Design a binder for this molecule. Structure first.
Ligand code: MG
Ligand code: MG
Lengths: 226, 219
């Protein structure tokens, strides 16, 4: 299958530099134009530029917003695409996508494959690991078909963090709220709803991962006793 | 640069109904040699990467349901969805490829459903958090509709507003509801000089709020 995987994202100082990578497999890399597209948290997609295919000499083009500041290149031996960013600023904070563009002008068009994206934050605020607290039912744990539990993920920087339940096995009935920033620190909570017959009979644990600080923590939800 | 405009930028419809989205370009995207307009549509569901739906203005990408149809030429284009389904919930972007590439600002599609009351849960600060000097009281207002809703905090029966942070999730693909959290953050000392904590949810489907609370002395 066609595979596109971005890497290299992280936290960088304003005025700093960063080079993102995109590893590909599953198709003849040299036959394709490759594009980079970014997207701030909850904003629109913005095309940044591309590098053409082999018959086109691997030449490059850029959006007026980053031309002269960003540089696209590629390693045809390893089938890897790169994006070198310079003199970074707050407006450059976003999720960056690697995308397979056209291989032929006459047969078709469109960016038919997209990676999952890699996150970038430009800030001078320091990296801080989150504290994870359990949100357990107290007087609840009664009789009413379903029960809702949660995990509070507080005081971290920068975004993002990923929250799963029971290592991913528990996926339905789960939603995580958007983080809120305050004084250089983010906070969010995750909610999970399961039938009373499954908890606390069977365990429920939230798994929290914060790559920027290389942290991965677990928090088992135990019912409150009083 | 060719500027792409998508207005209206937000649309709401019930499943089974027709939907048409607009995309206009500041310059023509019609190539006089090929007699095709270089415009594409992409679908981005909540939290996922985008997916190509249509290119060359009206050509459907492989694997795309016939429910989606693209049309238009020159500077005016539209994307139509025959019969909208709950799973079509997403933000749709158009993109020109006539000269380099440029995306429009997107049109967010919302699914209309029966009004629903939220399921409310309140949580006291955890013992683990207290042992640090902080006290966060959390309230979940889950799976309701419409999106608009109000939350009111009361300490010992008195309303509190300073120190409250609210956050709404995007609409859920399955069930088409929304959810939101309300978090009241105090210091441990502040938390300990009061006893009753209450979260009140007032929705567009309530003559009386949905109330949840706890007494600190009952632990
Ligand atoms: Mg539109
Ligand atoms: Mg663009």
């Amino acid at each position: 299958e066609v595979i596109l995987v971005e890497s290299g994202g992280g936290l960088v100082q304003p005025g700093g530099s960063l080079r993102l990578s995109c590893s590909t497999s599953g198709f003849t890399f040299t036959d394709y134009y490759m594009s980079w597209v970014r997207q701030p948290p909850g904003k629109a997609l913005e095309w940044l530029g591309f590098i053409r295919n082999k018959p086109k000499g691997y030449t490059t083009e850029y959006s007026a917003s980053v031309k002269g500041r960003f540089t696209i290149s590629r390693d045809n031996s390893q089938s890897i695409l790169y994006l070198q960013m310079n003199t970074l600023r707050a407006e450059d904070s976003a999720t960056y996508y690697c995308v397979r563009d056209i291989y032929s002008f006459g047969s078709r068009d469109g960016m038919d494959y997209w990676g999952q994206g890699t996150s970038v934050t430009v800030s001078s605020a320091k990296t801080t690991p989150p504290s994870v607290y359990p949100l357990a039912p107290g007087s609840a744990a009664q009789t009413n078909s379903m029960v809702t539990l949660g995990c509070l993920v507080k005081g971290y920087f920068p975004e993002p963090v990923t929250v799963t339940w029971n290592s991913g096995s528990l996926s339905s009935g789960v939603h995580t709220f958007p983080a809120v920033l305050q004084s250089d620190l983010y906070t969010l909570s995750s909610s999970v709803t399961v039938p009373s017959s499954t908890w606390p009979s069977e365990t429920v644990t939230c798994n929290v991962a914060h790559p920027a600080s290389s942290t991965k923590v677990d928090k088992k939800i135990v019912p409150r006793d009083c | 640069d060719i500027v792409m405009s998508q207005f209206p930028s937000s649309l709401a419809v019930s499943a089974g109904e027709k939907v048409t989205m607009s995309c206009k370009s500041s310059q023509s995207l019609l190539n006089s040699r090929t007699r095709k307009s270089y415009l594409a549509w992409y679908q981005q569901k909540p939290g996922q990467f985008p997916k190509l739906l249509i290119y060359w203005a009206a050509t459907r990408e492989s694997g795309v349901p016939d429910r989606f149809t693209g049309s238009g030429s020159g500077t005016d284009f539209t994307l139509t969805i025959s019969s909208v389904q709950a799973e079509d919930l997403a933000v749709y972007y158009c993109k020109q490829s006539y000269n380099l590439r440029t995306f429009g600002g997107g049109t967010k599609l919302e699914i209309k459903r029966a009004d629903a009351a939220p399921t409310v849960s309140i949580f006291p600060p955890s013992s683990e958090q207290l042992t640090s000097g902080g006290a966060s009281v959390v309230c979940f207002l889950n799976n309701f509709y419409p999106k608009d809703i109000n939350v009111k905090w009361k300490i010992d029966g008195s309303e509190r507003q300073n120190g409250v942070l609210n956050s709404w999730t995007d609409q859920d693909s399955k069930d088409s509801t929304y959810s939101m959290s309300s978090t009241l953050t105090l210091t441990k000392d502040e938390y300990e000089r009061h006893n009753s904590y209450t979260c009140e949810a007032t929705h567009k489907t309530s003559t009386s709020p949905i109330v949840k609370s706890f007494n600190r002395n009952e632990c």
